Amino acid sequence: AWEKQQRKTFTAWCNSHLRKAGTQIENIEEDFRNGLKLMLLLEVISGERLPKPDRGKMRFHKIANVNKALDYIASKGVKLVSIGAEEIVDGNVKMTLGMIWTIILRFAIQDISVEETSAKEGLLLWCQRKTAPYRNVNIQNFHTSWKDGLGLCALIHRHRPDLIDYSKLNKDDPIGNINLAMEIAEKHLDIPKMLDAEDIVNTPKPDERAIMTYVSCFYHAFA
C-alpha cells in the first residue's frame, strides 16, 4: 500500500519544484534513471549549482549524473547508507522512492525549527500549535491523525479563515474533507494536490512520509 501513496505524493512534490526549472516528470520509477531531472530538482530546492549534466544515452553517462546528485546530497550531511547510483540507474522502485524521501526530508523538513524542536518533531509541534483551537482535531502523528481531513482544513482555516467555512465540517465525510482542503490549497495557495483521499481514508495507517511531504508544503506556504 505504501508504494502507491509515496509514488503519487513524491511525484507531485517533485513536480511542484521541477516546474520552476521548466520541466515535469510523469513516472518516477523511470524518469530519474538518467540523473538529469534529479540534478535539476536538487538545483531548484537548494539554489546551488551542480556540475554540468551529461546528456549521453549510455549507462556510464547516467551513473555519472546520478553520482553528481548523490555526492551533492552527501555534501549536505545526508548519510547515504543503502543507496548508490547503480540502483537508481537500474530503476529500483523502493530505492528510488527512498532516495526522493531523503531529499524531501533534507530540503523540505530538516531546517524546520519551532520552539527548539526541528525536522519531523518540529513540523508536528507546528501542526499542533496551529490546530490547537479546533476540538474536533487532535494531531499526534503524521498518519492516523490526518485520516478524516479536518487537520488539513483547520491548517487552512487558521491562516486563511476567509477561504473555508470550518464550522460546517465534521468527521462523517473524510473523503470530502481531504478533497476540499486539497482543492482549496491548489486553487489559492499554489500547493498541488499530492494525496489520494481514498488511499488515505481506507488504509488503517496511511503512509506518514507522504503525509509529511504534503503537510510540509503548508508549513512553507504559510512561512
CATH code: domain of residue 74: 1.10.418.10
The answer to whether the beta carbons of residues 213 and 13 sit under 8 Å apart is yes
The whole domain housing 16 covers 1-112
Region of 115 on the Ramachandran plot (φ > 0 left; ψ -120 to 50 alpha; else beta)? left
Residues 3 and 64 grouped into a single domain: yes
What is the rounded CA–CA span in Å between residue 7 and residue 210? 9
What is the rounded CA–CA span in Å between residue 134 and residue 136? 6
**Helix (H, G, I), strand (E, B), or coil: what is residue 117?**
strand
Residues 6+ apart with CB under 8 A from 161: none
Q: How far apart are the first and last CA of the chain?
A: 32
Task: Among 81, 112, 143, identify where a domain stops.
Answer: 112
Phi, psi torsion values for 71, nearest 5 degrees = -70, -35
Residues 157 and 101 grouped into a single domain: no
Residues 209 and 164 grouped into a single domain: yes
Residues 103 and 123 grouped into a single domain: no
What is the rounded CA–CA span in Å between residue 200 and residue 149? 10
Method: X-ray
Task: Among 80, 112, 144, identify where a domain stops.
Answer: 112
Residues 90 and 151 grouped into a single domain: no
Residues 126 and 20 grouped into a single domain: no
CB atoms closer than 10 angstroms to residue 121: 11
What is the rounded CA–CA span in Å between residue 136 and residue 37? 42
How many domains does one find in the chain? 2
Residues 11 and 95 grouped into a single domain: yes
Residues 94 and 119 grouped into a single domain: no
DSSP code for 49: P
CA dist list (Å): 135 to 22, 63, 146: 43, 52, 14
Residues 121 and 107 grouped into a single domain: no
